[PDB]
Design a protein around this ligand. Structure first.
Ligand SMILES: *[C@@H]1O[C@H](CO)[C@@H](O)[C@H](O)[C@H]1NC(C)=O
Ligand SMILES: *[C@@H]1O[C@H](CO)[C@@H](O)[C@H](O)[C@H]1NC(C)=O
Ligand SMILES: *[C@@H]1O[C@H](CO)[C@@H](O)[C@H](O)[C@H]1NC(C)=O
Ligand SMILES: *[C@@H]1O[C@H](CO)[C@@H](O)[C@H](O)[C@H]1NC(C)=O
Ligand SMILES: *[C@@H]1O[C@H](CO)[C@@H](O)[C@H](O)[C@H]1NC(C)=O
Ligand SMILES: *[C@@H]1O[C@H](CO)[C@@H](O)[C@H](O)[C@H]1NC(C)=O
Lengths: 33, 49, 49, 272, 169, 50, 49
């Protein structure tokens, strides 16, 4: 649950995937604006 | 995240506040008035912003 | 080191307004089959045109 | 000519959440917008008139909400103006089932303004005369013609009239309803069908009626219509993805509504 | 024959006056536009927004105009602001070299003109040559990218930084 | 207890809080009328409208 | 405690300062002057406060 998940594209853990889904990012527009 | 977003929104919405001047949009201040008397309004907008 | 800012300047201006359609012209007042005598001089109101 | 409609059959009813309109011509998507404008407050007192064949005098009071549910076109038009004694301009709106006619010049307006139909053989028939609706007309600064307002179940017709800065604004909606429980519970915003640069002062108004003749016959009919008044209030409107007002909050209705306007959201979490 | 025109400018709303004309609509180009007295500047683009038939503008959550309806062709045009940004200069010390690179922060490399042009997520990087290597960060550029002064003649290179030497215990 | 020549009465922040009545020579305390914030206690609208 | 009290007292004392206006009592600016000047004086008080 805490080690990186290789199946997914970004090598995040299941808990880190949940964390990134659960926080709704707002000012992250960098490359295309 | 929210605190910064609302600080930015306060900053943006404060652009459209005349700060006592005859209007907030600079173009109207410039066209309506001559340069000397519109200078006062522009300076007030500048100090407020 | 952050030395300056750049802007892309607007090349040209465009102005667009709706189709020029509803005109009551003056052909009805100049191309009249017969005018009116001075003591009974004809008068027309022209509004919303 | 001037045979009077000596009838009011006045009643009173709840407005629910009816007379919401679009306050400007700006598209907005998936947004909550706070607008301070002249609205018909939620759950206010709307007068419910029944007219059968007096005092058809009504004020304007910053604007009017009008509604009707009549299946046919017994309701035709409206008379607007400060004083109606042919001194200053008086707006008049009339439907003839194929277009709508708006005039502005002063009229006599015999004290029971109504139209009559009275089948003819003159041209063919059915000219729906005007002779004693207002008798005379002169000094007509404005005039206007369009596709008729009163188009086409139950078919509720709602209109909002207001008068700002020389502009007479008319919003409306045509909502077909089934239960027919007078003003239904739900939401339906009124789109701005007309603006007229008329520049006159409106303070009183009245409606207009059809009254076919039998064969003065003037066969009796019944027309039921509601009138409410608008005053300045702050509303929180909810534009969906397409730009439609799908919901609204009256910020001075109750404490929860003031909270909703403060949080600028339609859902409030537990707290103080 | 005599005709006399008499003009009333009474305080009622004005309704008779001259044509306003219209000039043509330049899309995909930062123009200075005016649609029915709604003025501004920016890049006009075709849009799939669906206004309601009485709606003429589009507004943003911050109350700025995002769209217009063309008053002649009933078409919705999105408006984006022109392409401002910041300009940073990347330098090894002048004790080392007089050669520099320039970063145009947060803009596309296509619209740069106000030699080794690279598109980072921090902006358009000019004068640095990107390499498929990884070193410890020397000069922080932006989203994972650093710059350094390299040998193989000396030049300014841009790379994705190395977090460290990999190790399997 | 005003001194017979005094009319006002002031606080540390230089605000009047007493007055001598010019007709009955009586001393009246002055208190600001009343005011304060208004807070709305709600469960979620997910739970009730009360 | 003392710092909080000092800050509040300074805030209260700032009310009885003219901030360039010809008075510090809004009722006086209202009564003794006219809109095209009382309005400006009141706005200057508002900026100061
Ligand atoms: C740069 O612009 C081109 C076309 O102007 C576009 O296809 C490309 O996606 C843009 N790149 C970025 C990073 O904005
Ligand atoms: C009608 O009016 C036009 C105006 O352009 C004029 O040139 C023409 O001579 C007129 N013809 C008649 C028959 O009045
Ligand atoms: C109103 O309608 C009738 C028949 O529907 C028509 O004869 C009459 O000319 C119309 N009036 C106006 C002013 O268009
Ligand atoms: C309008 O909104 C509805 C949902 O309320 C949606 O189904 C419909 O697709 C929208 N209109 C368009 C043109 O997509
Ligand atoms: C404006 O005129 C053009 C003529 O080229 C026509 O194609 C277009 O439909 C018209 N639009 C409106 C809104 O009148
Ligand atoms: C003021 O007049 C009242 C009568 O109205 C009297 O009773 C009182 O003693 C007087 N006081 C002074 C100080 O003059």
């Amino acid at each position: 649950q805490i080690l990186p998940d290789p199946s997914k594209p970004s090598k995040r853990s299941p808990i880190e995937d949940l964390l990134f889904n659960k926080v709704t990012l707002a000012d992250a527009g960098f490359i295309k604006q | 995240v929210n605190h910064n977003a609302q600080a930015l929104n306060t900053l943006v919405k404060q652009l459209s506040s005349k700060f006592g001047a005859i209007s907030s949009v600079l173009n109207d201040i410039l066209s309506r008035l001559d340069p000397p008397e519109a200078e006062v309004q522009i300076d007030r907008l500048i100090t407020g912003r | 080191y952050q030395t300056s800012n750049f802007r892309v300047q607007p090349t040209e201006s465009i102005v667009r307004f709706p189709n020029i359609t509803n005109l009551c012209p003056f052909d009805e007042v100049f191309n009249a089959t017969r005018f009116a005598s001075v003591y009974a001089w004809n008068r027309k109101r022209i509004s919303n045109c | 000519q001037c045979v009077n409609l000596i009838t009011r059959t006045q009643s009173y009813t709840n407005s629910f959440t009816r007379g919401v309109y679009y306050p400007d011509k700006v598209f907005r998507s998936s947004v909550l917008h706070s607008t301070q404008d002249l609205f018909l407050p939620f759950f206010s007192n709307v007068t419910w008139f029944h007219a059968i064949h007096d005092n058809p005098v009504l004020p304007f009071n910053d604007g009017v909400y009008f509604a009707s549910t009549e299946k046919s076109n017994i309701i035709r038009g409206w008379i607007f103006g400060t004083t109606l004694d042919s001194k200053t301009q008086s707006l008049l709106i009339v439907n003839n089932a194929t277009n709508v006619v708006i005039k502005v010049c002063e009229f006599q307006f015999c004290n029971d303004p109504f139209l009559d139909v009275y089948y003819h053989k003159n041209n063919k028939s059915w000219m729906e005369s005007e002779f004693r609706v207002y008798s005379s007309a002169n000094n007509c600064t404005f005039e206007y013609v369009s596709q008729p307002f009163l188009m086409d179940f139950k078919n509720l017709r709602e209109f909002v009239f207001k008068n700002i800065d020389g502009y007479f604004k008319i919003y409306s909606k045509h909502t077909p309803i089934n239960l027919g429980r007078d003003l239904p519970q739900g939401f339906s915003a009124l789109e701005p069908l007309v603006d007229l640069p008329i520049g006159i002062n409106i303070t009183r108004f009245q409606t207009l009626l059809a009254l076919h003749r039998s064969y003065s016959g003037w066969t009796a009919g019944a027309a039921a219509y509601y009138v409410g008044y608008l005053q300045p209030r702050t509303f929180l409107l909810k534009y969906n993805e397409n730009g439609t007002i799908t919901d609204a909050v009256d910020c001075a209705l109750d404490p929860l509504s003031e909270t909703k306007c403060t949080l600028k959201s339609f859902t409030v979490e537990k707290g103080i | 024959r005599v005709v006399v025109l008499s003009f009333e400018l009474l305080h009622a709303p004005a309704t008779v006056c001259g044509p306003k004309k219209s000039t043509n609509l330049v899309k995909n180009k930062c123009v200075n536009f005016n649609f029915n007295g709604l003025t501004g500047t920016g890049v006009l683009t075709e849009s799939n927004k669906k206004f309601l038939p009485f709606q003429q503008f589009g507004r943003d959550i911050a109350d700025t105009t995002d769209a217009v309806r063309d008053p002649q062709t009933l078409e919705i045009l999105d408006i984006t602001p022109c392409s401002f940004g910041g300009v940073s200069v990347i330098t090894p010390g002048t004790n080392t070299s007089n050669q520099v690179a320039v970063l145009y922060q947060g803009v596309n490399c296509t619209e740069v003109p106000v030699s080794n042009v690279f598109q980072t997520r921090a902006g358009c990087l000019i004068g640095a040559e990107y390499v498929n290597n990884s070193y410890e960060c020397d000069i922080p550029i932006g989203a994972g990218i650093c710059a350094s002064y390299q040998t193989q003649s000396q030049s300014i290179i841009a790379y994705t930084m190395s977090l460290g030497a990999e190790n399997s215990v």
